[PDB]
């Protein structure tokens, strides 16, 4: 019947105060939460943040709201949320967030005869996380998400997850292009500020870099220019005016890689791991041009010394550079 | 009990005016403040501003709000803030700011039986600060933050900090990549406008540049091109058609550094300290090409003069450039 329900809700709201949390003098409230993740949009190493969109749910139990005469479990419109009590809940490591308001504001009110209240949301959050780029790009990032109450202390409100094998779903929906997902952890603390002890639930997960792309970008140029710096050893010195045309170009090419490839890179002050790598390949083409520099000063003394340099040459650069790889590719992995 | 409190609040708001500040005819109000800083996001030298996020707190003491029958210290919901008096408080050197409204508007009301009212906020502020870039990048910046009342004069309202060794916390949480934090100062003034004298509290702190990055960007190119401008002195003049190929390239390379490195730079009219430095290294490779220019005009007169030029040459450039460093790196530090 339509008749029972309208006067039933009005009995539940006549004299219902909105300014106070339930069980005010007595025991603290026991609020559980639940998160379903839709997707993670993008990760900016420039701004050290990321953007996701979740489904945010909450339980609590108010004795002020307890119908009796209806066996059904109710469902109301979102405009009743301005006439009820909700707990204050905010995100700690965020920078900008909002609630989707496409046709209505996406929030859900659901009731139960005991007083169990379900409160859904749909929030897009730009949350910031600090990054360590010492091992860039062979890195593992741990970007987190923390949830707090704001006004109430731990004497009034009690956060808890709804089971560690639960309450975080939608994991395999996450498709980052650049990264990959590893692990989940769930945290419950008691953080104490200058006012008082506050509860906190935290969400944390690893991020692993997909390595199989930057070889195509960074490494395969710097592989080949080492080999193009080795052309001169098989070049007989009759093109002594044209040997340097290689030796200018390769040193110039590393400068372009130092700059034009830098345009696709973030900006930190401390030294990245690829910077030591680009320091290493820059030194060899700097020394490969210093092959011919010691040629032209003592070639006039004797060519017999200059006849033996390419015996010295092509037995050093294809091993010091190869051992430079095994220092590089093993100190990290 | 639930019964006492609801009628207690209603006695505190029946006939409570919102249009007037407490102790209206009598003495001025004595409002204290308190700031906790979460983080500083970014510093734009392009826009001369920075972005932080704080926890903003206030005290005052209203005799209109004084419950007696409850030994507890209360805590209310943020919707009661539209039915109370708050002091007008704004930031002076800002450009755009807002209050986080993630699930609710992040503000806190806390009461006490005497009338002590605590009012919390959580504000992200884009505040502008003027910069001096004479000593760029070996600079110290003093970007500030000032807090004023808006409508009330000093006859009504009285700002004060809650102890100079207090009221600004969260210092070591600040992690700028580019800068570093030095010192804190706290200011209390009496600023007078055309209307009347207004109070002000100000927050100020130094910013020191992390120097160990721009060597990798700016200096190590300009170091090496000076040395690559010294290759020609050990070059015997048989490659007189190929000496100039160095001398064109280095002068061209400084032009790229004058322009492509300029793309990663701000825009001021007055002369930066690195501009005098890039003026200096540009002159030497301009004069190193003017070595060969005086070669080819009097080589036909005698090679005996041209036999002595590299005796003149490599005893001047590795000292005038080295003394150019000691003028540069000591006039600043």
């Amino acid at each position, epitope marked *: 019947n339509m008749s029972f329900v309208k006067e039933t809700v009005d009995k539940l709201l006549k004299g219902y105060d909105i300014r106070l949390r339930p069980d005010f003098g007595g025991p603290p409230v026991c609020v559980g939460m639940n998160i379903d993740i839709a997707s993670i949009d993008m990760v900016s190493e420039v701004n050290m943040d990321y953007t996701l969109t979740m489904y945010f749910q909450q339980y609590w139990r108010d004795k002020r709201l307890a119908y009796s005469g209806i066996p059904l479990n109710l469902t109301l419109d979102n405009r009743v949320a301005d006439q009820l009590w909700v707990p204050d809940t905010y995100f*700690l*490591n965020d920078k900008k967030s909002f609630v989707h308001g496409v046709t209505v504001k996406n929030r859900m009110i659901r009731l139960h005869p005991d007083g169990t209240v379900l409160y859904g949301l749909r929030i897009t959050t730009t949350a910031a996380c*600090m990054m*360590d780029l010492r091992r860039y790009p062979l890195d593992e990032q*741990n970007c*987190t998400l*923390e949830i707090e109450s704001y006004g109430y202390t731990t004497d009034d409100i009690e956060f808890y997850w709804r089971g560690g094998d639960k309450a975080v779903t939608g994991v395999e929906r996450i498709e980052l292009p650049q990264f990959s997902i590893v692990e989940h952890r769930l945290v419950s603390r*008691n*953080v*104490v*500020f*200058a006012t008082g*002890a506050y509860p906190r639930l935290s969400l944390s997960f690893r991020l692993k870099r997909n390595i199989g792309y930057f070889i195509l970008q960074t490494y395969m140029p710097s592989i080949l220019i080492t080999i193009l710096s080795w052309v001169s050893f098989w070049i007989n010195y009759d093109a002594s005016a044209a040997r340097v045309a290689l030796g200018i170009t390769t040193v110039l090419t590393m400068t372009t890689i130092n700059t034009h490839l830098r345009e696709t890179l973030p900006k930190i002050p401390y030294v990245k791991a690829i910077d030591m790598y680009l320091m290493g390949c820059f030194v060899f083409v700097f020394l490969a041009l210093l092959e011919y520099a010691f040629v032209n000063y003592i070639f006039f003394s004797q060519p017999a010394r200059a006849a033996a340099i390419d015996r010295w040459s092509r037995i050093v650069f294809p091993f010091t550079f190869s051992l430079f790889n095994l220092v590089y590719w093993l100190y990290y992995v | 009990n639930m019964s006492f409190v609801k009628e207690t609040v209603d006695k505190l708001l029946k006939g409570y005016d919102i249009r007037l500040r407490p102790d209206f005819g009598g003495p001025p109000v004595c409002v204290g403040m308190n700031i906790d800083i979460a983080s500083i996001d970014m510093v734009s030298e392009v826009n001369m501003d920075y972005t932080l996020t704080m926890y903003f707190q206030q005290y005052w003491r209203d005799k209109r709000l004084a419950y007696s029958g409850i030994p507890l210290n209360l805590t209310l919901d943020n919707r009661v803030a539209d039915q109370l008096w708050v002091p007008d408080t704004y930031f002076l050197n800002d450009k755009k700011s807002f209050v986080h409204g993630v699930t609710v508007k992040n503000r806190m009301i806390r009461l006490h039986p005497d009338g002590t009212v605590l009012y919390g906020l959580r504000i992200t502020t884009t505040a502008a600060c003027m910069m001096d870039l004479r000593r760029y990048p070996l600079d110290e910046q003093n970007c500030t933050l000032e807090i004023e009342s808006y409508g009330y004069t000093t006859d009504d309202i009285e700002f004060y900090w809650r102890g100079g*060794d207090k009221a600004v*916390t969260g*210092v*070591e*949480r*600040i*992690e700028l990549p580019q800068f*570093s*934090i*030095v010192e804190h100062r706290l200011v209390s003034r009496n600023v007078v406008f055309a209307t009347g004298a207004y109070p002000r509290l100000s927050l100020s702190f130094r910013l020191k540049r992390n120097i160990g990055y721009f060597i990798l960007q700016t200096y190590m190119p300009s170091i090496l091109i000076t040395i690559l401008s010294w290759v020609s002195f050990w070059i015997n003049y048989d490659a007189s058609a190929a000496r100039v190929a160095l001398g064109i390239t280095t002068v061209l390379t400084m032009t790229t550094i004058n322009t492509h490195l300029r793309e990663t730079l701000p825009k001021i009219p007055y002369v930066k300290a690195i501009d005098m430095y890039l003026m200096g290294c540009f002159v030497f490779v301009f004069l190193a090409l003017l070595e060969y220019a005086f070669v080819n005009y009097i080589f036909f007169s005698q090679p005996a003069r041209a036999a002595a030029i590299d005796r003149w040459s490599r005893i001047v450039f590795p000292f005038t450039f080295s003394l150019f460093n000691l003028v540069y790196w000591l006039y600043y530090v």
Partner: nanobody
Framework: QVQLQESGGGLVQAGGSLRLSCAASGHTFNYPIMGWFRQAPGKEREFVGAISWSGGSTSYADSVKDRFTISRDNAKNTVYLEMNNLKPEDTAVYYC??????????????????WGQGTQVTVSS
């Protein structure tokens, strides 16, 4: 995950000088701030000092305002604690501890996660 260890005990007469140390290990990037306390022989601990990760700021407590100077090393991952003009009210154990990044105020022992077993320093008349 992050294991800690100190060094530097002993005993001096009153008003002398002494230096501390604390070692680090593991993924220390997730713990920017490190701090110290003193479990009294009868009482609980009280805050003395804290240091930023970059080594810039160094906040104190009110009694230890400009009494003790405490420094930073990124390279050895150590913290150095220079005590000068020592007092007979300083005989306690100084525990090394770190803090998570988004982890509350500076003065609270409940906040910290990892703990190194400090040394027992004493001082005579």
């Amino acid at each position: 995950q992050v294991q800690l260890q100190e060094s530097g005990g002993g005993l001096v007469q009153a008003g002398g000088s002494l230096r501390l140390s604390c070692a680090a290990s593991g993924h220390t990037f997730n713990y920017p701030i490190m701090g110290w306390f003193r479990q009294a022989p009868g009482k609980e601990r009280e805050f003395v000092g804290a240091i930023s990760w970059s080594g810039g700021s160094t906040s104190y407590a009110d009694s230890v305002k400009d009494r003790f100077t405490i420094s930073r090393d990124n390279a050895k991952n150590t913290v150095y604690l220079e005590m000068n003009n020592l007092k007979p009210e300083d005989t306690a154990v100084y525990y090394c501890a770190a803090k998570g990044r988004y982890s509350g105020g500076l003065y609270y022992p409940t906040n910290y996660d990892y703990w190194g077993q400090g040394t027992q320093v004493t001082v005579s008349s």
